[PDB]
Design an enzyme around this catalytic site. Structure first.
Site, short mmCIF file in Angstrom:
data_model
loop_
_atom_site.label_atom_id
_atom_site.label_comp_id
_atom_site.label_asym_id
_atom_site.label_seq_id
_atom_site.Cartn_x
_atom_site.Cartn_y
_atom_site.Cartn_z
CG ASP A 141 -1.75 -1.27 1.32
OD1 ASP A 141 -1.84 -2.01 0.31
OD2 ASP A 141 -2.31 -1.54 2.40
CE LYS A 146 -7.04 -0.26 1.57
NZ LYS A 146 -7.51 -1.66 1.74
N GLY A 174 -3.47 -2.22 10.75
CA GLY A 174 -2.76 -1.14 11.40
C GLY A 174 -2.18 -1.46 12.76
CE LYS A 197 -2.89 -22.30 12.62
NZ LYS A 197 -2.23 -22.86 13.83
N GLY A 257 -1.61 -7.16 9.92
CA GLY A 257 -0.66 -7.64 10.90
C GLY A 257 0.65 -8.14 10.35
N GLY A 284 0.76 -3.41 4.40
CA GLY A 284 0.41 -2.01 4.43
C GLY A 284 1.34 -1.17 5.28
CB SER A 285 0.91 0.22 8.68
OG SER A 285 -0.40 0.66 8.39
#
Lengths: 291, 291, 291, 291
Positions: free
Chosen positions: C21, C78, C150, C162, C211, C232-233
């Protein structure tokens, strides 16, 4: 003591047959002529046990001795839950298999017999996959669904048969990390839950018991995956025990042929007047025994 | 196996008629002379089943064979819920339609028959639109409202008939994004909820059953949108079964002519002494079966 | 409109890659040099969205036009949940895939877009098997686990991965009568639950998102069965975005070689200071969006 | 892979020693001179982890490489719960034992690593006998009580040490029929509960961790039956790390000589300012991790 293989080799000879509960030598003679594979000597059929009430115990040793002398097929017997001394007396009499029945009054409210110390193979009840696996751990050489004995309603036997067989089908495809989680939820040994998942069936012969009352119900259980059927009050509480007996035995041998099943059901006679299984209070349900 | 169209072409011939439940060949002969379109052989009318209690099963194969030889109109039969082997025996006997009855004791407490594997068309109960659509998914070739069998009270049949027909009218005008939301709430296949909304009726023939006891109640159901009526205990538990039979058959043919309906109701006789439907406990209500 | 196959043929080209991102043309240039397969233009990384609060919307059309002119790999964007007009503006700009993000503020609290009416393929979130199957019904051409955007904690992404993959493994071995029962419990179309059970995987490409913060977490998701990873972050909030970028891209290409993974992780730099996922209140959890 | 005996032969060499957690090469050099048996490289001592918050992960591979080159005693490392890829990177670096720490943020909220697939021995936490036996089933080669890391209060470590050792003493004298009942209540394998009951100790080496802050607390755990002690924040957060280090190491070697213990405690210096363990909310308690 007898090796587990030989006890798991006396239970396999009974595949594809009918076991009829009898109380007198004449009833034992009737069952043998119909082509049954074994008889189960007891003081009174499960239908009478509900009616009479009180405390039920092991049959009189005199009766079990008379039945054995009357038939050539193996003779079984019943013992109370946890009464390891009653199972000792039956074994000395010469019975070929002892059935830890939940129909009789439990003698030990916490534990079952330690079935690995004996030589005669045992058979025990089971409502789901968790109960089936714990019993085999103790040494059970066969499993039969509890059902609702003496009611003539095949609703409960089908329910328990889809619980055991429904769970064994879900275990296919699971990974080791997950089969360990299942063994916790059902509280079963992890060694068995992996043996079951690899075989897709209970590692011991499995029968159907409770609520079988007509040649149709007998062939229904065999179409759900059973290896046989235990028929008690259904035959000798019917209009004509002699005709019902041959019909049920023949039903299990043609459970997959619709044309023949119609022929068998003709002229058999009225079945036992049962009791709706949903009408029985939980505290009165025999199936709740066998924790 | 029979194509769904032909099973949905045996159910359409029954439009605008009366189906009378009979137990003996003579009762079967009576219904045919009155002008009925079919008969439903069973061991005892639903009124007796409540009184006798116990476990109810499929009729004796001997009876269903005798009725078939007595009448020329199609003969139906009843089977327990989930007993796919009983439905196999009836089909071999020559019945033209098998009725998965909730009156009889359920044999499988989770599942119904897999009706797509058979050739004879089926008929199943329904209390609302959700139940009607699930049954058609399994292969049901006709639907009949559950009502409250054996009570002689048309309060319950009207309630269920306005639930099914009331919902189908709301589906008109809705947009696709909304018909998907409804299918979730009623737990029905989305393919059917769109077929129903386009047709504004159940895609299969729909009858009325339970509580029809007089020529007035018969014509009431036909004025609510039914295609026919199932009449059981109402006729043969009345004062004069012969006169009530011709009246009910004639009522359905003139349900929209007030002048004639007065003529029919004169001289018919007293109807069956029913039981107030609101007096029956929920656990005793047959309508609660057929999840 | 584009055929479902071609939309399910633009989602398959992304297998075994990394999607980064970016917010500015320079960040878009950085990702391409590291070897990424696509970029996701947005106004601010999910880490900033939690910090800034307020209402988040579609990026400015000026930005998405500048990024597209800067990179050669496909550009995504998005849109808010249920805002079918925002997805219309992006498609006109030339984006190759529109992502119905739960990070942005939902615009419709009941419904999602009707994704079958458009030509550009979509990607949607999913927490379990029920959500994955409903989204594919509406026309989603890809699925990515929601996780907890985030936070830099891979605890939530593994949990959801899972759940989806754990359920698909249980469906193996089940019979038709049972796969219909599952479709009710998870509230999914019965046509898909049978297609999934036959394939043992989601019928569309599945990615991991939320994550992923280190080269170890990237290769963990690929070892749980993912086809890729959304980062992303994690990269541009780290100590050195340039070094972390090449490491993560190389981690996914050697997720099964322990020796190499040690080499990649050396000299990468400190990861983003995350937030413990178990510390976030439920009302603040972005994963709860996307009913 | 390494045989269970050799992994249960690397854990036995550590008996009767002290393991000191270090963050820099100089701290690693300090511990070795004091006579420690091993060091545990991590990014920050558990006391700092509570203060800093956020997400904690595996140490930087650069640090663990520098410590290893600095000391001759074995070097251990920490990994997040369920992160089987982090444990793969550490093993490739050359660590001699990987510690599945509950101090770090869990990565998998349901499962732990499958420790039997690796070669380096592991160490895992435990609050009672049930947890100790499940961990050994998965392949743990050592057990250490969870305690309350970073608080400097030995109240929690003593509690957990009397829970594990208190239960193992009750198992003496029980009969087989009863040891099976215990394995159900504590949800442990029945094979281990019989091995434990015969040995009267955990079949693997057991250490004490969490809350050891003074030479008195170190010798207290050894007098409750521990084989060693894990000392973290206690030494290097004290007034004089160099003096406290030699005192704690000497305390464990004279835990049974009251006269000497007085000599050791003189001149050591003030201990770390702890936090009352009963003041910590349950949701903040690290001990609650490691289900």
């Amino acid at each position: 003591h007898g090796t587990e293989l030989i006890k798991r080799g006396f239970a396999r000879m009974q595949k594809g047959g009918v076991i009829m509960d009898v109380t007198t030598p004449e009833q034992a003679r009737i069952a043998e002529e119909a082509g049954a594979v074994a008889v189960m000597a007891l003081q009174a059929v499960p239908a009478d046990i509900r009616k009479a009430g009180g405390v039920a115990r092991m049959a009189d040793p005199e009766i079990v001795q008379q039945i054995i002398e009357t038939v050539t097929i193996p003779v079984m017997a019943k013992a109370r839950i946890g009464h390891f001394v009653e199972a000792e007396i039956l074994e000395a009499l010469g019975v070929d298999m002892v059935d830890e029945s939940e129909v009789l009054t439990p003698a030990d409210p916490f534990y079952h017999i330690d079935k690995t110390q004996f030589t005669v193979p045992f058979v025990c009840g089971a409502r789901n996959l968790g109960e089936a696996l714990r019993r085999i751990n103790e040494g059970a050489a066969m499993i039969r669904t509890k059902g609702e004995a003496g009611t003539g309603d095949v609703s409960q036997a089908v329910k328990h048969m889809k619980q055991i067989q429904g769970e064994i089908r879900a275990l296919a495809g699971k990974t080791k990390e997950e089969l360990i989680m299942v063994a916790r939820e059902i509280e079963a040994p992890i060694e068995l839950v992996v043996e079951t998942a690899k075989m897709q069936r209970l590692p011991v012969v499995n029968f159907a018991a409770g609520g079988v009352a007509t040649p149709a119900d007998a062939a229904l259980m065999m179409r759900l995956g059973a290896d046989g059927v235990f028929v008690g009050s259904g035959i000798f509480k019917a209009e004509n025990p002699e005709k019902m007996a041959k019909a049920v035995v023949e039903a299990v041998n043609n459970y997959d042929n619709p044309v023949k099943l119609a022929e068998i059901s003709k002229g058999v006679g009225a079945g036992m007047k049962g009791i709706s299984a949903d009408m029985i209070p939980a505290q009165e349900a025999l199936q709740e025994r066998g924790w």
